[PDB]
Amino acid sequence: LSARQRRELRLFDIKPEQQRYSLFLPLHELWKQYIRDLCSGLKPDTQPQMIQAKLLKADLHGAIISVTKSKCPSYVGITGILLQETKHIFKIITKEDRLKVIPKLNCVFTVETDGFISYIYGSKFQLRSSERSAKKFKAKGTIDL
Amino acid sequence: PAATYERVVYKNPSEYHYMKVCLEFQDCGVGLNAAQFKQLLISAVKDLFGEVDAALPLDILTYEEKTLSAILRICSSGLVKLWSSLTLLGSYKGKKCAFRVIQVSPFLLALSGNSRELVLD
Amino acid sequence: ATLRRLREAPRHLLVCEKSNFGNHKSRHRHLVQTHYYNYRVSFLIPECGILSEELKNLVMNTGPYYFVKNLPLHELITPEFISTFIKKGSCYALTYNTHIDEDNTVALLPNGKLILSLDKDTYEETGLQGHPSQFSGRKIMKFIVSIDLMELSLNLDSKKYERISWSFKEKKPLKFDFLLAWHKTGSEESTMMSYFSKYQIQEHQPKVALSTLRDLQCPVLQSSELEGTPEVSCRALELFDWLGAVFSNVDLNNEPNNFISTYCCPEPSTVVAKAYLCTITGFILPEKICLLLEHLCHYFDEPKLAPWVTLSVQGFADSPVSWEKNEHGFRKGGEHLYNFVIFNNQDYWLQMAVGANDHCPP
Amino acid sequence: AVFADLDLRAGSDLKALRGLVETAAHLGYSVVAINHIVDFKEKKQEIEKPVAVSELFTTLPIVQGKSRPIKILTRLTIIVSDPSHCNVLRATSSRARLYDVVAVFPKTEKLFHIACTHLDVDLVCITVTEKLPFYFKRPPINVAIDRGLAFELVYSPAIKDSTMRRYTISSALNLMQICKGKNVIISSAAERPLEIRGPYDVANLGLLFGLSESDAKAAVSTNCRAALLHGETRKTAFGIISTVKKP
Amino acid sequence: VRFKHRYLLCELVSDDPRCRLSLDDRVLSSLVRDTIARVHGTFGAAACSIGFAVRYLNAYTGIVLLRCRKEFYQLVWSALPFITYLENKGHRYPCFFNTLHVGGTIRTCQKFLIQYNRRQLLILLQNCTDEGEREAIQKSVTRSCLL
RNA sequence: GCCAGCGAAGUGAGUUCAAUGGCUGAGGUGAGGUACCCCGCAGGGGACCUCAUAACCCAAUUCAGACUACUCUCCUCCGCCCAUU
């Protein structure tokens, strides 16, 4: 069945690259309103480990990221909303039509919230990211960037 | 008349090491002397590392009284042992002295010009 | 294992050469001009009390240099700065008091290459293409990014120039204390005090130290022998160590007492009544060192009493690139230095002193 | 490539603290980390406002180098002998969440085993005073160096006596022989107002211990920044960093 | 998971067998530590507080087998000749002398001790020429042949 | 599924209160620089100096195969990003 599902593909082509990126702008508004309806607390200050639990347990599909430090300097300085997510890479789309494939090998991403900024070290974040919300996130290893 | 060209390259011909150290005595009772500093250098390495290692060939250059600065030389064998002996703070009478090293070189010119600050404004 | 670590080595490289000033193969002028950053320029003349005015006017006019507090790097990549200082002369720039193994250190070359040695954090935050330069075994300590501004000045609308401009302006604004100089090779004059008028620029002159030393025991040399003949001439390396001892204001005899100081003077030698000592300290231009070396070469045109004069130059101990390609590291010390022992028959000795971890040029 | 990072055991009064900060900023130091010795007999927890550096110091320490603002850390050194006191430190993983680097000091071999095996700490304190012999098992050291545990060696035996010098140099030679020297950082204590030597010669005090001719200095300059990194990944989040940024 | 130990044999050569009877493990350990503390400092003597220890001692025979580490046996064996002036209940002057340095390996160290003992027996025989000791020599040879 | 041992000499290292990769110099390879030499296609070849040659780990009867831990090192299939025609 798997090899029979791999006939056409489920991945992008050349034809969805020219889709006029302002049409992808309501995805950012969808993610922003989803963060507004998920957290629902802003004003005094509250519990950054609640924020770490929301950032671990939620799917980051369709979110705004920006590479802030990486082992390759050409990867750094790339912003955009993300579209796919694989075992050790994920694919984003940027400004005027071109898409980039950023590997989660040794790198860290700035994510801009409605009023917050979060650094996410994309080292341990891997392996079919539905496994992230499921189970097995322990405390192992530090990342020097 | 003589005019020619020749390339000569050496490997470790230095055989000496020099240390410029400024002294920072804690108490105001500064009864220094040129011989007593040498006696402290002998008595420190004796109790700290050894009497055999205390009589390493060492001497003192430009021993300054008010400026509280000096240069100590040892050859390339016991420089590490001299650094650790001056590190572990051997005392004289009971007034504990802070021995803080400014600079170490194998050259008396790069040490003498400046290495530490390289401009003081 | 540990006992060998107590006494293994620091690394030493000491290279001596002999050459002629009237030789066409002599590359002393290239070695002085292509050496960029300099701190201490001293010269020594035996048997000469009163200095001539022609050399005194050259000593009193070795500078000036400039010091700018908190200057951003994106000022250094503007086309006005390239067409003003780089394309019309030799512009020299270096950060102040930032360690090469610890902090970020930026230097500017007269060929147009802005070379900056960064740590891992700044190399990741700026996002510029470089190469791994200084290691810690398996880990990497310091990177070096080189940006050729003369190639980018031909195409200012290229993607490389706007990438570097976005990296320096909006991505990571880096500011440092800069020492600046500009050797004028242009018909259109424009001072540096008017260009960097927004920041606190300070003009500085190099410090001049003069000394007249009495009863100095100078060794006897042969021009056509580097290793030294037995019982006639001395060795140039022992003469260099004695030179450092004299420049440390230390000149005494054997002193038998409790504080024993055994110091063998290089023998056979000659007593000198007056020794003239001059030390220039600051941001020394290499063209002034070229004119100083030519004047010390032409000093032996007249019959003088000095058999050989000494010109020692110590560079900056905190520069990324010295000796045209070589990296200056800091393993508990170590410097780089070059000396000239000028005889009376236009022969000279080229010495090169290397610190701990640095490669030596020919 | 962050040099000038040590751990100090120094609190008596504000005047001696200002003197030690001025001395460290004068000689060679750009990060000051203050330890707080807590033994198993007292069992006190005063974490909220015990020190208050920034409300009492004057706005900047000035150094002779790059003139950068010194980051000041407040660390906790807990002397743990009893296994129930280690269970009390197990209870403090959720109750009070401060003190960015938590430093345990073990005395029992089973407790040192579970410290490197299960107990979530940052840097294990190893000091030997007055006849403390201790054996080393190699697979927990291997799990420790794979995890990121940097071994602290707090030294000040040179000021009081010479027998303490002997026991510290013997324990340090045993550590360098068995542990093989992967991540071990040394640091000085400060009881008297002048108990600090030159920063470049701390490398030779670690070289007398051994560990390399140069990777002693390289290992302390790397592993102290890695220790601050491990404390930050324990404090903020294990993979995430969330900071409030209001321009 | 192990450390390569080194071992050393030393013979006490002296007359007046009260010196032969005056041996103890703690006394010899404190003597060696005190005479290393005169020669070497904390780094030399404190490494002997963890590495060096007494291993094999004989009162009448005077052969002492001692342990020492890989990176410290040169320091220990250089500190061995400077063991002078043992003060005790009498006015004695004992002194150590090295026979051979064996690189660990206790078994061949005991093998070399047997050949050294046989050389110490057989060479002393012809110069003395006395039957009262020769009978005990014959008994010792017979008991060794029974082994 | 069950059913078969030999107390006597001494492993191209064979120890067991548990030895064996120690120092120096030139060549190998990855690199840089040249005021050296030979040959005339701008150049090519040899010569001189320096740096790097690590880590994983340690044998007690051997071998075969599988495993896990590697990166100075070599043969390939590759991906992403940067720059050029």
Curated annotation (Swiss-Prot), chain A:
Give GO cellular component annotations, separated by semicolons.
multimeric ribonuclease P complex; nucleolus; nucleoplasm; ribonuclease MRP complex; ribonuclease P complex
Q: Which residues form a coiled coil?
A: none
**Keyword field:** Nucleus, Phosphoprotein, RNA-binding, tRNA processing
Any GO MF annotation of the entry: ribonuclease P RNA binding
**What's a BP term from Gene Ontology annotated to this protein?**
rRNA processing
Localization (cell): Nucleus, Nucleolus
Give start-end of the signal peptide: none
According to its UniProt entry, the function of this protein is described as: Component of ribonuclease P, a ribonucleoprotein complex that generates mature tRNA molecules by cleaving their 5'-ends.
| Quaternary data | Component of nuclear RNase P and RNase MRP ribonucleoproteins. RNase P consists of a catalytic RNA moiety and 10 different protein chains; POP1, POP4, POP5, POP7, RPP14, RPP21, RPP25, RPP30, RPP38 and RPP40. Within the RNase P complex, POP1, POP7 and RPP25 form the 'finger' subcomplex, POP5, RPP14, RPP40 and homodimeric RPP30 form the 'palm' subcomplex, and RPP21, POP4 and RPP38 form the 'wrist' subcomplex. All subunits of the RNase P complex interact with the catalytic RNA. Several subunits of RNase P are also part of the RNase MRP complex.
Q: Which family does it belong to?
A: Belongs to the eukaryotic/archaeal RNase P protein component 1 family.
Q: What is this protein called?
A: Ribonuclease P protein subunit p29
Supply the source organism for this entry.
Homo sapiens
Q: What is the lineage of its organism?
A: Eukaryota, Metazoa, Chordata, Craniata, Vertebrata
Curated annotation (Swiss-Prot), chain B:
Function field = Component of ribonuclease P, a ribonucleoprotein complex that generates mature tRNA molecules by cleaving their 5'-ends.
Q: Which Gene3D superfamilies match?
A: Ribonuclease P, Pop5 subunit
Domain of life the protein comes from:
Eukaryota
Molecular functions (GO terms): ribonuclease P activity; ribonuclease P RNA binding
Q: Does the keyword Electron transport apply?
A: no
Species name:
Homo sapiens (Human)
Q: Which Gene Ontology terms of cellular component type are present?
A: multimeric ribonuclease P complex; nucleolus; nucleoplasm
Q: Which family does it belong to?
A: Belongs to the eukaryotic/archaeal RNase P protein component 2 family.
Q: In its UniProt record, which GO terms are filed under biological process?
A: tRNA 5'-leader removal
Pfam families registered for this protein in UniProt: RNase_P_Rpp14
Any other comment in the entry?
This protein is produced by a bicistronic gene which also produces the HTD2 protein from an overlapping reading frame.
Q: How does it assemble?
A: RNase P consists of a catalytic RNA moiety and about 10 protein subunits; POP1, POP4, POP5, POP7, RPP14, RPP21, RPP25, RPP30, RPP38 and RPP40. Within the RNase P complex, POP1, POP7 and RPP25 form the 'finger' subcomplex, POP5, RPP14, RPP40 and homodimeric RPP30 form the 'palm' subcomplex, and RPP21, POP4 and RPP38 form the 'wrist' subcomplex. All subunits of the RNase P complex interact with the catalytic RNA.
Q: Which UniProt keywords apply?
A: Nucleus, RNA-binding, tRNA processing
Question: Which protein, by its recorded name, is this?
Answer: Ribonuclease P protein subunit p14
Subcellular location(s): the record lists:
Nucleus, Nucleolus
UniProtKB/Swiss-Prot annotation, chain C:
Q: Which GO terms describe its cellular component?
A: multimeric ribonuclease P complex; nucleolar ribonuclease P complex; nucleoplasm; nucleus; ribonuclease MRP complex
InterPro entries membership? RNase_P_Rpp40
Q: Which UniProt keywords apply?
A: Nucleus, RNA-binding, rRNA processing, tRNA processing
Q: What is its main location?
A: nucleus
BP-aspect Gene Ontology terms? endonucleolytic cleavage in ITS1 to separate SSU-rRNA from 5.8S rRNA and LSU-rRNA from tricistronic rRNA transcript (SSU-rRNA, 5.8S rRNA, LSU-rRNA); tRNA 5'-leader removal
Record's subcellular location: Nucleus, Nucleolus
Molecular function (GO) terms listed? ribonuclease P activity; ribonuclease P RNA binding
PANTHER family membership:
RIBONUCLEASE P PROTEIN SUBUNIT P40
Q: Per its database record, what is this protein's job?
A: Component of ribonuclease P, a ribonucleoprotein complex that generates mature tRNA molecules by cleaving their 5'-ends. Also a component of the MRP ribonuclease complex, which cleaves pre-rRNA sequences.
Give the record's subunit note: Component of nuclear RNase P and RNase MRP ribonucleoproteins. RNase P consists of a catalytic RNA moiety and about 10 protein subunits; POP1, POP4, POP5, POP7, RPP14, RPP21, RPP25, RPP30, RPP38 and RPP40. Within the RNase P complex, POP1, POP7 and RPP25 form the 'finger' subcomplex, POP5, RPP14, RPP40 and homodimeric RPP30 form the 'palm' subcomplex, and RPP21, POP4 and RPP38 form the 'wrist' subcomplex. All subunits of the RNase P complex interact with the catalytic RNA. Several subunits of RNase P are also part of the RNase MRP complex.
What this protein is called in its record is: Ribonuclease P protein subunit p40
UniProtKB/Swiss-Prot annotation, chain E:
* InterPro entries, per the entry: Pop5/Rpp14/Rnp2-like, RNase_P/MRP_POP5, Rnp2-like_sf
Coiled-coil annotation reads none
Keywords, in A-Z order = Nucleus, Phosphoprotein, RNA-binding, rRNA processing, tRNA processing
Q: Does the keyword Phosphoprotein apply?
A: yes
Subcellular localization is given as: Nucleus, Nucleolus
Predominant place of localization: nucleus
- Superkingdom in the source lineage: Eukaryota
Checking SUPFAM superfamilies in the record gives: Rnp2-like (SSF160350)
User: Sorted alphabetically, which Pfam families does this protein's record hold?
Assistant: RNase_P_Rpp14
Q: Is the Phosphoprotein keyword given for this protein?
A: yes
Mind telling me which GO cellular component terms the entry cites? multimeric ribonuclease P complex; nucleolar ribonuclease P complex; nucleolus; nucleoplasm; ribonuclease MRP complex
A single Gene Ontology biological process assigned to it is:
rRNA processing
**Record-linked PANTHER family:** POP5 HOMOLOG, RIBONUCLEASE P_MRP SUBUNIT
Q: What assembly does the database describe for this protein? A: Component of nuclear RNase P and RNase MRP ribonucleoproteins. RNase P consists of a catalytic RNA moiety and 10 different protein chains; POP1, POP4, POP5, POP7, RPP14, RPP21, RPP25, RPP30, RPP38 and RPP40. Within the RNase P complex, POP1, POP7 and RPP25 form the 'finger' subcomplex, POP5, RPP14, RPP40 and homodimeric RPP30 form the 'palm' subcomplex, and RPP21, POP4 and RPP38 form the 'wrist' subcomplex. All subunits of the RNase P complex interact with the catalytic RNA. Several subunits of RNase P are also part of the RNase MRP complex.
Function description? Component of ribonuclease P, a protein complex that generates mature tRNA molecules by cleaving their 5'-ends. Also a component of the MRP ribonuclease complex, which cleaves pre-rRNA sequences.
For this entry, the protein name equals Ribonuclease P/MRP protein subunit POP5
What is the taxonomic lineage of the source species?
Answer: Eukaryota, Metazoa, Chordata, Craniata, Vertebrata
